[PDB]
């Protein structure tokens, strides 16, 4: 699993035309204001400890940015080893679950197998931009 | 090197504190419409093959996206094999000129070695974003 956290003040998104032959998550969009937006791209591999591992993390982090808010986002294009798309978006769903058993703030899962337009106000402070690996 | 290629409706940063103790570039603030932001890693190893092998593409993508600006976006979160900062800054400025000599329109690079916001306000067609690796 690659992660990439990124410290908004804003972050929006909007799903356009579909990237998979049949999206598993309905099209939409959402915007938000100050959170942690995790671009996600899942591994081939990952499994129930890599989630776990990603999850504690995530919180943890959110918890030192003192955020109340994180944004799970799908993306194919933080590294090359990615999962296959049905594993990915099992993954993921893991992910939100096991999230929402450590971190006490709002989790949203933005929807996965689309094109997504999206602008983020990212922060400029040191923590703003961190990546992260995890495997098991 | 690594690379993440967003086509922006529009683009724009900020320098905010210094990550290095003395940062090769200025302090400074830039904004943007249509462009492509490339943001850039660069990695050990890279040489004057590999910036040559970026250049082109970089031009080429850009020549398909019909956009006549590009953004050198340094960043050090897109892989875990990273050059060093003397040599990463040296990589980006040839990147710069070897860029200028294949595409046509307006070049920018961002400056190295600040902490940076930005805001992107990334198109959600099916090239708005791709990642890249070169090597030598
Ligand atoms: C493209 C860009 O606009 C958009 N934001 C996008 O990335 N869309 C992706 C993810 O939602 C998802 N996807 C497929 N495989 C993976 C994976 N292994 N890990 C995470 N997501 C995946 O399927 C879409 C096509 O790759
Ligand atoms: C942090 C985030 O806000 C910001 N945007 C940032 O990434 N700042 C980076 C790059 O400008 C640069 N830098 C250092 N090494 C590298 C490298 N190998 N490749 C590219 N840039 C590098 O040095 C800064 C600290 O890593
Ligand atoms: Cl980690
Ligand atoms: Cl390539
Ligand atoms: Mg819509
Ligand atoms: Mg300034």
């Known amino acids: 699993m690659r992660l990439l956290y990124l410290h908004a003040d804003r972050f929006e ?11 598993p998550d309905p099209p939409g ?3 938000f204001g100050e959170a942690l937006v995790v671009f996600t791209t899942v591994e081939d591999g990952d499994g129930p ?14 918890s030192r940015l003192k955020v109340t808010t994180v944004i799970l986002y799908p993306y194919a294009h933080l590294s090359s080893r990615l999962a296959k798309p ?4 099992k993954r993921l769903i ?6 929402r058993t450590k971190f006490p703030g709002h989790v949203h899962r933005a ?3 689309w094109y997504k337009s999206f602008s983020i ?12 690996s995890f495997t098991e």
Chains 1, 2 share one sequence.
């Open 29 to 31: 969009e959402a915007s």
């Open 94 to 99: 893991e992910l939100e679950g096991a999230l």
């Open 13 to 23: 998104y909007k799903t356009v035309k579909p990237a998979l032959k049949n999206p």
């Open 121 to 132: 106000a990212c922060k400029g402070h040191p923590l703003a931009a961190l990546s992260r």
């Open 49 to 62: 400890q890599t989630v776990m591992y990603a999850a504690s993390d995530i919180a943890s982090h959110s």
């Open 111 to 113: 929807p996965f197998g």
């Open 86 to 89: 049905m594993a990915a978006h």
